[PDB]
């Protein structure tokens, strides 16, 4: 009966790039999800399969919290059945997803005058990701018949690109922080429960 460490995830000082999205597994704690739904600080809070307020009476063996930053125009891809550079090549939720997607504007932390270029996304990959896969490869993408042997050039493109967030960007181009909560149940040790 210790409380779940959501402050570690939502209020973490640093967030991951989407290609390397960070996930913390949270277990053996009590979670109150209604405080989040009424946080009013979140511009996206969409749940799939389960209900947000209704599941606060539920228990699971483990909940996973995946987190990352993308631009606002891409938050809609963090949902089942969507397509685009993020869903295809960076972070893909499954069709049978049971969980919640939570997002909020982070222009004031992750933008910098002249651009914050530390946040990257994967632009080139030969195949789409399967659900919940994480590709951190930086191999040069071979768009022609000639092997690249680690040297960038014609038909040989570095696979990650920077967002370059600037504070004067329009809302669709400003950074948004995202947390995906996944609800796991197996063999029922029941470690993460509601109040």
């Amino acid at each position: 009966t210790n409380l779940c460490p959501f402050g570690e995830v939502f209020n973490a000082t640093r967030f991951a790039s989407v290609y390397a999205w960070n996930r913390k597994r949270i277990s053996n704690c009590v979670a109150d999800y209604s405080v989040l739904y009424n946080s009013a600080s979140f511009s996206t809070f969409k749940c799939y399969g389960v209900s947000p307020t209704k599941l606060n009476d539920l228990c699971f063996t483990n909940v996973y919290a995946d987190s990352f930053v993308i631009r606002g125009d891409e938050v809609r891809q963090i949902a089942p059945g969507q397509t685009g550079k993020i869903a295809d090549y960076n972070y893909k939720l499954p069709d049978d997803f049971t969980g919640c997607v939570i997002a909020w504007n982070s222009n004031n932390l992750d933008s910098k005058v002249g651009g914050n270029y530390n946040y990257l996304y994967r632009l080139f990959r030969k195949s789409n990701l399967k659900p919940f896969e994480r590709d951190i490869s930086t191999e040069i993408y071979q768009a022609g018949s000639t092997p690249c042997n680690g040297v960038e050039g014609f038909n040989c493109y570095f696979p990650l690109q920077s967002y370059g967030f600037q504070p004067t960007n329009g809302v669709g181009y400003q950074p948004y922080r995202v947390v995906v909560l996944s609800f796991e149940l197996l063999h029922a040790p029941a470690t993460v429960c509601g109040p």
Partner: antibody
Amino acid sequence: MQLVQSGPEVKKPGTSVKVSCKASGFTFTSSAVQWVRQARGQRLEWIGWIVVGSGNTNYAQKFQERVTITRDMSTSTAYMELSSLRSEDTAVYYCAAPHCSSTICYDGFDIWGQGTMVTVSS
Amino acid sequence: EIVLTQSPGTLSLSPGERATLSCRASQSVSSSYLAWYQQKPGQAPRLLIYGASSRATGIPDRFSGSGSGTDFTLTISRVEPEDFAVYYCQQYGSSPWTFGQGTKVEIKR
């Protein structure tokens, strides 16, 4: 299939000029676009190039501070803009790209634009 | 900057003869990124050869190309009259992707 370019341009010294390359008949998203120029009766000269997918550019030092290569994938065209035009910049400007399918790209510049004549004189 | 010197400056051949143009580099260049182009006056270049060896789709069997290191050649086995034009070699392995001076293939009488 093809690459088509802007009209011809004549500009006074010190101004800018922006010519365009519209792609037709191949999956433009996955290719790259290189801009070169050629004085009348002289050799070809490499200006720069750009990666259609990522927008990253490389420029020869001759033009590092004066040329800007961009692309709009929505209309699937590329642009070369030369500012602070010198007299000696008058030439035909060609734009070239490798034709690409959904799966693979060509290992050389096979598609060439028709060229745009650009004359710089007071 | 990679310099590309072409030889000869201009060769003159009666139709049906053999043509051999050469491209030489100031230092070794990847053979995977070296190309030859045929340009006629007024027109834009046509890609003749890519990767120093491979023929561009739709270009006739007449044309061939070889070489590596610093020496590259383009060979026209039997120069049909359509083949009298300028030929430029371009490397594109190391930026800047420079060009040769071009050799002029004129017809001899």
